[PDB]
Amino acid sequence: VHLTPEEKSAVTALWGKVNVDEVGGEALGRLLVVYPWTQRFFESFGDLSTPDAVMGNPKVKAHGKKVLGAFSDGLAHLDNLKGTFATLSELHCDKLHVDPENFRLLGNVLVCVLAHHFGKEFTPPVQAAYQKVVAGVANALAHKYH
Amino acid sequence: VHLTPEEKSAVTALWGKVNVDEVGGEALGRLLVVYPWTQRFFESFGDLSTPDAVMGNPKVKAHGKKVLGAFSDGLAHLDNLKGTFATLSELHCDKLHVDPENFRLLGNVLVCVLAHHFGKEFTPPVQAAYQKVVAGVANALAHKYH
Amino acid sequence: VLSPADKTNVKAAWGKVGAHAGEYGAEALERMFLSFPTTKTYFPHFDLSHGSAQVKGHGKKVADALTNAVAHVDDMPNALSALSDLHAHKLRVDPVNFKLLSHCLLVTLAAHLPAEFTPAVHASLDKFLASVSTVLTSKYR
Amino acid sequence: VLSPADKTNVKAAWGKVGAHAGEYGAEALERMFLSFPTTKTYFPHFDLSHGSAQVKGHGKKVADALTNAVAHVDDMPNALSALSDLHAHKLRVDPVNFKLLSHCLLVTLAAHLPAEFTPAVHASLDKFLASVSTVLTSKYR
Ligand code: HEM
Ligand code: HEM
Ligand code: HEM
Ligand code: HEM
């Protein structure tokens, strides 16, 4: 992913304000609610029967923390997303067989969650920079399919 | 793309029966009929207003021949599709901005045309081998997006 | 969304299918499982071998469901409501798999009915299967 | 296919747009053009700059069309037939672009309507925009 220094600055500044404990769970939870077939990959996570159950599910919150951590790792090394995500790509593609459109969906759900949290601060240029990031992350996760 | 010896033999045997003057135009023509937004990329080709107009359009047939030629070339370079198709990928991605789902659609329309022409010869194992090939070609065309 | 002519094309084509509906459903499933092996994960306990009586039995169910959909092409959500609940709510089938099965059905139809599989009929059938797929992947209770 | 709850959620959420229709529609277009520059190809002679009055005017048209879709949510193909002819027959817009604009509409609603944009309403809005997109990308005359 090629971000301008200005775009990288905008992205990094906003991410510094993202709640490490909650935002990943909010994004994963909304993925499960908005695109319900994704729940099939999370049988062991317990109660996903209603939107409230999903968003309150402790395992969803905990797993979401890991997801956010991976986006964070992506941001730390935008010039090597493929290498950063190689083990995760093997898992999601070779082991789990997640269809890669779902990687795009989760990235865009995260973008919606950032807009929800930050309101007017999530300007169109800030969004555009984030879209480069989540597209790069989705591509890196899908690398074993390519 | 790796084919078993059995798959390679079966793919080659079927391709030898393909009419190279017609099948590409049939595949391209059916793409334009079945997925009509794809016509936007071929505005200069003249009359595309009815299925009969599309299928009998001389520029569709001529262009289809070039497309078929690219698939034929790919069959001889299955281990280096990203290399072989690099120039075409730059054209379709960077210059024309064709969304890559359309590459998948054309490959599957080609498979439908092979089924139409060869019927009982196009067995499920033969189809499975061809799906590997057209997925490989679509992926290589989409490389600039990855 | 199907045009009035699409609906006529689909009815005419599926009618020509007639008594082979079940055989074709079985073949389309076999084509999908072989061409797109990830789809087998939805049938973990099935006998998926070539000639499987279980796959043949299931192919008939799929074909009969399509025949029902063709019969209710103006009212598919109501006609398919149970099947939607099964695929979207219970089984949680990823929508990509419906594109894969739809393609394998078209391939099967093309292989068996080449005269009937004109570009216009191909187009209408593709739209019809996409419409069925949208209903079966929707939760709308 | 929309559930009864989906229709309730959409009517409530979109109903809060009101006189901000032009503003929100314009912001969603600006987000799309900036984030996904390939979409600009459909507007070759527009002023697509930030704050453009032309995008502001177009934003109002899009938003008003969504209001129309809400008021006809059970019979959308007949209500949007003119827009389907424009986008599918005349302009031949690739379907992917509707996913991009839909996403940008969701981002815009999330940024302006924090209390309304719950996970359930988010889900319903996404299905609604997907349904609108299917109509505008279909040829069904
Ligand atoms: C697109 C961005 C995504 C990122 C950054 C991401 C990140 C991660 C991470 C960090 C893990 C934990 C790996 C480990 O502990 O070894 C994980 C596991 C997993 N992911 Fe994702 N993921 C993404 C998309 C998806 C999607 C779309 C799905 C399904 C629809 C999915 C399904 C799973 C499953 C099932 C697991 C294992 C859960 C378990 O331990 O039971 N992932 N992911
Ligand atoms: C997926 C397999 C495809 C293959 C193998 C293929 C192959 C080719 C080839 C060989 C050319 C000629 C390049 C040249 O003259 O230098 C070409 C040109 C072109 N292709 Fe494709 N293509 C594919 C998919 C698509 C799709 C899905 C579209 C969507 C519309 C598309 C749009 C075009 C256009 C607009 C041109 C230039 C036509 C002109 O000269 O005016 N291609 N393609
Ligand atoms: C045209 C699209 C489809 C149609 C018409 C269809 C129709 C049906 C029918 C009629 C049944 C039997 C229901 C019953 O009698 O209880 C069934 C079951 C099932 N379908 Fe589909 N289906 C479609 C697409 C798919 C796809 C794409 C998948 C996954 C790749 C899938 C996975 C399943 C599974 C797992 C079952 C239950 C099998 C069992 O364990 O008994 N279906 N479907
Ligand atoms: C929710 C989805 C959409 C809605 C509700 C919508 C609605 C509208 C409306 C109301 C108009 C004006 C119609 C008139 O002037 O009579 C219009 C025009 C237009 N739309 Fe959309 N649209 C949508 C998606 C898109 C997308 C995704 C694109 C392309 C990226 C697009 C490209 C255009 C173009 C090129 C025009 C004509 C502009 C001109 O030259 O005057 N639309 N749309």
Coordinates of all heavy atoms in Angstrom, one line a residue, chain D residues 29 32-33 38-40 42-44 46 54 58 60-66 80 83 86-87 91 93-102 105 129 132-133 136, ligand 4:
Chain D
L29 N -21.6 10.9 -2.3 CA -20.9 11.0 -3.7 C -19.5 11.4 -3.6 O -18.6 10.8 -4.2 CB -21.7 11.9 -4.6 CG -23.0 11.3 -5.1 CD1 -23.8 12.4 -5.8 CD2 -22.8 10.1 -6.0
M32 N -17.4 8.6 -2.4 CA -17.2 7.6 -3.4 C -16.2 8.1 -4.4 O -15.3 7.3 -4.8 CB -18.5 7.3 -4.1 CG -18.3 6.2 -5.2 SD -19.8 6.0 -6.2 CE -19.9 7.5 -7.0
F33 N -16.3 9.3 -4.9 CA -15.4 9.8 -5.9 C -13.9 9.8 -5.5 O -13.0 9.5 -6.2 CB -15.8 11.2 -6.5 CG -17.1 11.2 -7.2 CD1 -18.0 12.2 -7.0 CD2 -17.3 10.2 -8.2 CE1 -19.2 12.2 -7.8 CE2 -18.5 10.2 -8.9 CZ -19.5 11.2 -8.7
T38 N -12.1 5.3 -9.8 CA -12.7 4.8 -11.0 C -14.1 5.2 -11.2 O -14.6 5.2 -12.4 CB -12.5 3.3 -11.1 OG1 -13.1 2.6 -9.9 CG2 -11.1 2.9 -11.2
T39 N -14.8 5.5 -10.2 CA -16.3 5.8 -10.3 C -16.5 7.1 -11.1 O -17.6 7.3 -11.6 CB -17.0 5.8 -8.9 OG1 -16.4 6.8 -8.1 CG2 -16.9 4.5 -8.3
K40 N -15.5 8.0 -11.1 CA -15.6 9.3 -11.7 C -15.8 9.1 -13.2 O -16.3 10.0 -13.9 CB -14.3 10.1 -11.5 CG -14.1 10.5 -10.0 CD -13.0 11.5 -9.8 CE -11.7 10.9 -10.1 NZ -10.6 11.8 -9.6
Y42 N -18.0 7.7 -14.9 CA -19.4 7.8 -15.3 C -19.9 9.2 -15.3 O -21.0 9.5 -15.8 CB -20.2 7.0 -14.3 CG -20.0 5.5 -14.5 CD1 -19.1 4.8 -13.6 CD2 -20.6 4.8 -15.5 CE1 -18.9 3.4 -13.7 CE2 -20.4 3.4 -15.6 CZ -19.5 2.8 -14.8 OH -19.4 1.4 -14.9
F43 N -19.0 10.1 -14.9 CA -19.4 11.6 -14.8 C -18.4 12.4 -15.5 O -17.8 13.4 -14.9 CB -19.5 12.0 -13.3 CG -20.5 11.3 -12.6 CD1 -20.3 10.0 -12.0 CD2 -21.8 11.8 -12.3 CE1 -21.2 9.3 -11.3 CE2 -22.7 11.1 -11.6 CZ -22.5 9.9 -11.1
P44 N -18.1 12.2 -16.8 CA -16.9 12.7 -17.5 C -17.0 14.3 -17.6 O -15.9 14.9 -17.7 CB -17.0 12.1 -18.9 CG -18.4 11.8 -19.1 CD -18.9 11.3 -17.7
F46 N -18.7 16.3 -15.4 CA -19.1 17.0 -14.1 C -17.9 17.7 -13.4 O -16.8 17.4 -13.6 CB -19.6 15.9 -13.1 CG -21.0 15.6 -13.2 CD1 -21.6 15.2 -14.4 CD2 -21.8 15.6 -12.0 CE1 -23.0 14.9 -14.4 CE2 -23.2 15.3 -12.1 CZ -23.7 15.0 -13.3
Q54 N -22.5 21.3 -8.4 CA -23.1 20.2 -9.3 C -23.2 18.9 -8.5 O -24.2 18.1 -8.6 CB -22.2 20.0 -10.5 CG -22.8 19.0 -11.5 CD -22.1 19.1 -12.9 OE1 -21.0 19.5 -13.0 NE2 -22.8 18.6 -13.9
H58 N -26.6 16.9 -7.5 CA -26.7 15.5 -7.8 C -27.0 14.7 -6.5 O -27.8 13.7 -6.5 CB -25.5 14.9 -8.5 CG -25.9 13.9 -9.5 ND1 -26.7 14.1 -10.6 CD2 -25.7 12.5 -9.4 CE1 -26.9 13.0 -11.2 NE2 -26.3 12.0 -10.6
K60 N -28.7 15.6 -4.0 CA -30.1 15.7 -3.7 C -31.0 14.8 -4.5 O -31.9 14.2 -4.0 CB -30.6 17.2 -3.9 CG -32.1 17.4 -3.5 CD -32.6 18.8 -3.6 CE -34.1 18.9 -3.7 NZ -34.8 18.1 -2.6
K61 N -30.6 14.6 -5.8 CA -31.4 13.7 -6.6 C -31.2 12.2 -6.1 O -32.2 11.5 -6.0 CB -30.9 13.8 -8.1 CG -31.1 15.2 -8.7 CD -30.6 15.2 -10.1 CE -30.7 16.7 -10.7 NZ -30.2 16.8 -12.1
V62 N -30.0 11.8 -5.7 CA -29.8 10.5 -5.2 C -30.6 10.3 -4.0 O -31.3 9.3 -3.8 CB -28.3 10.2 -5.0 CG1 -28.2 8.8 -4.3 CG2 -27.6 10.2 -6.3
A63 N -30.5 11.2 -3.0 CA -31.2 11.1 -1.8 C -32.7 11.1 -2.0 O -33.4 10.3 -1.4 CB -30.8 12.2 -0.8
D64 N -33.2 11.9 -2.9 CA -34.7 11.9 -3.1 C -35.1 10.6 -3.8 O -36.2 10.1 -3.5 CB -35.0 13.1 -4.0 CG -34.9 14.5 -3.3 OD1 -34.7 14.5 -2.1 OD2 -35.1 15.5 -4.0
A65 N -34.3 10.0 -4.6 CA -34.6 8.7 -5.1 C -34.7 7.6 -4.0 O -35.5 6.7 -4.1 CB -33.5 8.3 -6.2
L66 N -33.8 7.7 -3.0 CA -33.9 6.8 -1.9 C -35.2 7.0 -1.1 O -35.8 6.0 -0.7 CB -32.6 6.9 -1.0 CG -31.4 6.4 -1.7 CD1 -30.1 6.6 -0.9 CD2 -31.5 5.0 -2.1
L80 N -39.0 2.4 -9.4 CA -37.7 2.9 -9.8 C -37.5 2.6 -11.3 O -36.3 2.6 -11.7 CB -36.6 2.3 -9.0 CG -36.7 2.6 -7.5 CD1 -35.6 1.9 -6.8 CD2 -36.7 4.1 -7.1
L83 N -35.3 4.9 -13.2 CA -33.9 4.9 -12.8 C -33.1 3.7 -13.2 O -31.9 3.7 -13.5 CB -33.8 5.1 -11.3 CG -34.1 6.5 -10.7 CD1 -33.9 6.5 -9.2 CD2 -33.2 7.5 -11.4
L86 N -32.2 4.2 -16.8 CA -31.1 5.1 -16.9 C -29.8 4.4 -16.6 O -28.8 4.4 -17.3 CB -31.2 6.3 -15.9 CG -30.1 7.3 -15.9 CD1 -29.9 7.9 -17.2 CD2 -30.4 8.3 -14.8
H87 N -29.7 3.7 -15.4 CA -28.5 3.2 -14.9 C -28.1 1.8 -15.6 O -26.9 1.6 -15.9 CB -28.5 2.9 -13.4 CG -28.5 4.2 -12.6 ND1 -29.6 4.9 -12.3 CD2 -27.5 4.9 -12.0 CE1 -29.3 6.0 -11.6 NE2 -28.0 6.0 -11.4
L91 N -26.7 4.0 -19.2 CA -25.3 4.2 -18.7 C -24.5 3.0 -18.5 O -23.3 3.1 -18.5 CB -25.4 4.9 -17.3 CG -26.1 6.3 -17.3 CD1 -26.4 6.7 -15.9 CD2 -25.2 7.3 -17.9
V93 N -23.9 1.0 -16.0 CA -23.0 1.0 -14.8 C -22.7 -0.4 -14.3 O -23.6 -1.2 -14.0 CB -23.7 1.8 -13.7 CG1 -22.7 1.9 -12.5 CG2 -24.1 3.2 -14.2
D94 N -21.4 -0.7 -14.2 CA -21.0 -1.9 -13.6 C -21.6 -2.0 -12.2 O -21.4 -1.1 -11.4 CB -19.5 -2.0 -13.7 CG -19.0 -3.4 -13.3 OD1 -19.3 -4.0 -12.2 OD2 -18.2 -3.9 -14.0
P95 N -22.2 -3.2 -11.9 CA -22.7 -3.4 -10.5 C -21.8 -3.2 -9.4 O -22.3 -2.9 -8.3 CB -23.1 -4.9 -10.5 CG -23.3 -5.2 -12.0 CD -22.4 -4.3 -12.8
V96 N -20.5 -3.3 -9.6 CA -19.6 -3.1 -8.4 C -19.7 -1.7 -7.9 O -19.6 -1.4 -6.7 CB -18.1 -3.4 -8.8 CG1 -17.6 -2.4 -9.7 CG2 -17.3 -3.4 -7.5
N97 N -20.1 -0.8 -8.8 CA -20.1 0.6 -8.4 C -21.2 0.9 -7.4 O -21.1 1.8 -6.6 CB -20.2 1.6 -9.6 CG -19.0 1.4 -10.5 OD1 -17.9 1.9 -10.2 ND2 -19.1 0.7 -11.6
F98 N -22.3 0.1 -7.5 CA -23.4 0.3 -6.5 C -23.0 -0.2 -5.2 O -23.4 0.4 -4.2 CB -24.6 -0.5 -7.0 CG -25.3 0.2 -8.1 CD1 -24.8 0.2 -9.4 CD2 -26.4 1.1 -7.8 CE1 -25.5 0.8 -10.4 CE2 -27.0 1.8 -8.8 CZ -26.5 1.6 -10.1
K99 N -22.1 -1.2 -5.1 CA -21.6 -1.6 -3.7 C -20.7 -0.4 -3.1 O -20.8 -0.2 -1.9 CB -20.7 -2.8 -3.8 CG -21.5 -4.1 -4.3 CD -20.5 -5.3 -4.4 CE -21.3 -6.5 -4.8 NZ -20.3 -7.7 -4.9
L100 N -20.0 0.3 -4.0 CA -19.1 1.4 -3.5 C -20.0 2.5 -3.0 O -19.7 3.0 -1.9 CB -18.2 1.8 -4.7 CG -17.3 0.6 -5.2 CD1 -16.4 1.2 -6.3 CD2 -16.5 0.0 -4.1
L101 N -21.0 2.9 -3.8 CA -21.8 4.1 -3.4 C -22.6 3.7 -2.1 O -22.8 4.5 -1.2 CB -22.7 4.5 -4.5 CG -23.6 5.7 -4.1 CD1 -22.8 6.9 -3.6 CD2 -24.5 6.1 -5.2
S102 N -23.1 2.4 -2.1 CA -23.9 2.0 -0.9 C -23.1 2.1 0.3 O -23.5 2.5 1.4 CB -24.4 0.5 -1.1 OG -25.3 0.5 -2.2
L105 N -22.7 5.6 1.3 CA -24.0 6.1 2.0 C -24.0 5.6 3.4 O -24.4 6.4 4.3 CB -25.2 5.6 1.2 CG -25.5 6.4 -0.1 CD1 -26.4 5.5 -1.1 CD2 -26.2 7.7 0.2
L129 N -30.0 -1.0 0.6 CA -29.3 -0.4 -0.4 C -28.9 -1.5 -1.5 O -28.8 -1.2 -2.7 CB -28.0 0.3 0.1 CG -28.4 1.5 0.9 CD1 -27.1 2.1 1.6 CD2 -29.0 2.6 0.1
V132 N -32.1 -1.8 -3.6 CA -32.1 -0.7 -4.5 C -31.1 -0.9 -5.7 O -31.4 -0.7 -6.9 CB -31.8 0.6 -3.8 CG1 -31.6 1.8 -4.8 CG2 -33.0 1.0 -2.9
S133 N -29.9 -1.4 -5.3 CA -28.9 -1.6 -6.3 C -29.2 -2.6 -7.4 O -29.0 -2.5 -8.5 CB -27.5 -2.0 -5.6 OG -27.1 -0.9 -4.8
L136 N -31.6 -1.1 -9.8 CA -31.1 -0.1 -10.7 C -30.1 -0.7 -11.7 O -29.8 -0.1 -12.8 CB -30.4 1.0 -10.0 CG -31.2 1.9 -9.1 CD1 -30.6 3.3 -8.8 CD2 -32.6 2.1 -9.7
Ligands
HEM4 C1 -28.3 3.9 -4.5 C2 -27.8 3.9 -5.7 C3 -28.2 5.1 -6.8 C4 -29.2 5.9 -6.8 C5 -30.5 5.9 -5.9 C6 -29.1 6.8 -8.0 C7 -30.0 7.7 -8.3 C8 -29.8 8.6 -9.4 C9 -30.7 9.6 -9.8 C10 -32.0 10.1 -9.1 C11 -30.2 10.2 -10.9 C12 -30.8 11.4 -11.7 C13 -31.8 10.9 -12.6 C14 -32.4 11.9 -13.5 O1 -31.7 13.0 -13.7 O2 -33.5 11.8 -14.0 C15 -28.9 9.5 -11.3 C16 -28.2 9.9 -12.4 C17 -26.9 9.3 -12.6 N1 -26.3 8.3 -11.9 FE1 -27.1 7.4 -10.2 N2 -27.9 6.4 -8.6 C18 -27.3 5.4 -7.9 C19 -26.1 4.7 -8.1 C20 -25.2 5.2 -9.1 C21 -23.9 4.7 -9.3 C22 -23.2 3.7 -8.4 C23 -23.3 5.3 -10.4 C24 -21.9 5.2 -11.0 C25 -20.8 5.1 -10.2 C26 -24.3 6.2 -11.0 C27 -24.1 7.0 -12.1 C28 -25.1 8.0 -12.5 C29 -24.9 8.8 -13.6 C30 -23.7 8.9 -14.6 C31 -26.0 9.6 -13.7 C32 -26.3 10.7 -14.8 C33 -25.5 12.0 -14.5 C34 -25.7 12.9 -15.6 O3 -24.9 12.8 -16.6 O4 -26.6 13.8 -15.6 N3 -25.5 6.1 -10.2 N4 -28.7 8.5 -10.3

